[PDB]
Amino acid sequence: QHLVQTEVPRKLLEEWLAMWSGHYQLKDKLRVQLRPQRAGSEVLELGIHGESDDKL
Amino acid sequence: AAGGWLERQGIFGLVSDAVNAWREDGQQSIDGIFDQVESRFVAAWEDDAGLMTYGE
């Protein structure tokens, strides 16, 4: 048993982006980041990062 | 609302089957038939409700 709020991991988007990267024959392994936009904030930032950690 | 849930989970299906079998067999004691359906219902409810302690 798991809660609805724990059923959607960041890794799921990473898997989709691997499918995406695969189709478009891109090499860069795309990582997903979801964190407060700054310390202690209720505003969040979803970032897609490459191997170099650049925000794409 | 309860009926909706029982329909979706197939329990009303089990009830229909049980009653039909009961009738076909000459309407003898429903004790055992009912017990079996109740057991399936309890298992299905527990499963779908996501029953756990608050700590869990």
Side-chain angles (χ1 to χ4, degrees):
Chain A
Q1 301 299 332
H2 294 289
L3 301 165
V4 174
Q5 72 188 78
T6 68
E7 81 180 16
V8 186
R10 289 145 177 79
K11 184 219 311 103
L12 180 59
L13 180 49
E14 287 179 345
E15 286 170 15
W16 298 347
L17 290 178
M19 293 162 61
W20 183 84
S21 295
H23 173 76
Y24 284 111
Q25 288 173 304
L26 301 159
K27 307 153 163 286
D28 201 6
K29 187 175 165 174
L30 303 181
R31 172 176 60 81
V32 172
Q33 201 176 289
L34 179 62
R35 295 178 198 165
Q37 189 270 343
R38 63 172 179 184
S41 181
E42 292 299 324
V43 179
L44 307 180
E45 181 159 10
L46 189 296
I48 308 303
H49 298 262
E51 294 257 9
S52 61
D53 292 319
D54 288 6
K55 194 185 290 180
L56 307 180
Chain B
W5 183 89
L6 290 167
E7 187 62 42
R8 289 187 299 270
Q9 298 292 316
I11 304 300
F12 274 163
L14 295 182
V15 172
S16 280
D17 291 346
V19 172
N20 290 333
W22 166 78
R23 192 158 286 127
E24 269 160 34
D25 200 38
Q27 295 178 36
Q28 303 174 304
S29 107
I30 198 88
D31 262 294
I33 294 158
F34 179 70
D35 181 68
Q36 179 166 348
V37 172
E38 189 188 10
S39 290
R40 294 279 300 277
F41 155 63
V42 169
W45 194 90
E46 185 180 4
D47 193 348
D48 198 40
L51 197 73
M52 57 181 81
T53 67
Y54 183 74
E56 285 158 4

